[PDB]
Amino acid sequence: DMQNVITLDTSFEDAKTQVQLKKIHSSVILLYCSKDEAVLILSEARSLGL
């Protein structure tokens, strides 16, 4: 059964990544980007409660 899917894709500043990770975070969060963007997103996740 398909669950809720919410997608946002823009820069990592202006209060986007933090709120996006805080919202709709239940299980199996997918990351899909290039090397540098993946490194930045995972660093932000480590700095946050994810």
Next chain:
Amino acid sequence: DMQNVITLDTSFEDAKTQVQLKKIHSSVILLYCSKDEAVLILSEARSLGL
């Protein structure tokens, strides 16, 4: 019901203040501290989408 509490032992260093401000999820916030400290905390929250 309250979710958790945040201490902010450091004087806004070590990047742990962002972690403590992001780990909360309640819609009601009762921040209380010195004038400039409160101003900078709420500015960081605004830049963090809080």
